[PDB]
Amino acid sequence: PHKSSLPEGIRPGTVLRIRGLVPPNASRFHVNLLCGEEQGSDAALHFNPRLDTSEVVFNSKEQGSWGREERGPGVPFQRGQPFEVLIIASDDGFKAVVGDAQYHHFRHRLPLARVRLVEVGGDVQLDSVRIF
Amino acid sequence: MSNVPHKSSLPEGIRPGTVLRIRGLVPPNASRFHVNLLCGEEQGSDAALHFNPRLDTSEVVFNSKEQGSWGREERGPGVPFQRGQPFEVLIIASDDGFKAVVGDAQYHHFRHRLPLARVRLVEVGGDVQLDSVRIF
Numbered sequence A: 001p002h003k004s005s006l007p008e009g010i011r012p013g014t015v016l017r018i019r020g021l022v023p024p025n026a027s028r029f030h031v032n033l034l035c036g037e038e039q040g041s042d043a044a045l046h047f048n049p050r051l052d053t054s055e056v057v058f059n060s061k062e063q064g065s066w067g068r069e070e071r072g073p074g075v076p077f078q079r080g081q082p083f084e085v086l087i088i089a090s091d092d093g094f095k096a097v098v099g100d101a102q103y104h105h106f107r108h109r110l111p112l113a114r115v116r117l118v119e120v121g122g123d124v125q126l127d128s129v130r131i132f
Numbered sequence B: 001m002s003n004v005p006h007k008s009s010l011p012e013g014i015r016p017g018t019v020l021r022i023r024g025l026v027p028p029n030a031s032r033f034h035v036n037l038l039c040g041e042e043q044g045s046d047a048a049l050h051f052n053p054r055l056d057t058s059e060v061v062f063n064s065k066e067q068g069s070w071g072r073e074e075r076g077p078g079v080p081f082q083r084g085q086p087f088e089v090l091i092i093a094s095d096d097g098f099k100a101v102v103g104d105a106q107y108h109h110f111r112h113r114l115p116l117a118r119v120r121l122v123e124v125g126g127d128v129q130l131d132s133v134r135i136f
């Protein structure tokens, strides 16, 4: 599970670029925006491609409890294939970009200013995480 | 074949947290090309951002145009573009300005001079062969 601290926190205009490879046998993987380095910290954003059930789940976690799932059938990832994801913080939410198209817009639940790090876990080969 | 340009409207304008992703090739004998964030489709439209890699003079110029008049030019550090080489540029809008990212590295920050809400059009032209222009 990769972790990268956000160099100047996050505001509208912060961009995370995540390049990686989905393993041939992958079940799921996730990208989290967390509000602290301690285990169980609140997640302002949880981006969760599920290859074994062909869906994507978006959610947040507050006080060890998950929120309302923003989910849907289909997944813009394929086992064995490389990807490039953008997570873009906007004034009213996070835009999740996969490949050449915005896949979802996740409206803010937690205060944007509380986000401290990015976590990448689950079944994924991470090539790079860049923060612009 | 020809240079391949781009024009696309931004009906809802752009807001803080918008990414313009531009991928393309600078052709062998390129002089210069541009990326413009314009306020309308009229010729000579005001420009919130004029981003102008000049291969011929080895500079990258940033400017605005307001009420028909150009602002003071800003110049980035060196030229992260080469004739015969492909590139990727991100133009990222924030509350405070535009960040230009070129090939994996932060390149320049251009503070807003015009209100971001006025932007309604993106045009890419000049000596460039565009792979893709995407706005997120």
Ligand SMILES: OC[C@H]1O[C@@H](S[C@@H]2O[C@H](CO)[C@H](O)[C@H](n3cc(-c4cccc(F)c4)nn3)[C@H]2O)[C@H](O)[C@@H](n2cc(-c3cccc(F)c3)nn2)[C@H]1O
Pocket (backbone or CB within 6 Å): A046, A048, A057, A058, A059, A066, A067, A069, A121, A122
């Ligand atoms: O929200 C995000 C969270 O989701 C749950 S699974 C979730 O749990 C619920 C239980 O009440 C529901 O069963 C829910 N659900 C609704 C439907 C449904 C409802 C209606 C219609 C229809 F079609 C289908 N199907 N399933 C599940 O998605 C994951 O465990 C969790 N997570 C994963 C990890 C994790 C961390 C590290 C490594 C790792 F492998 C996993 N750490 N937290 C996190 O990703």
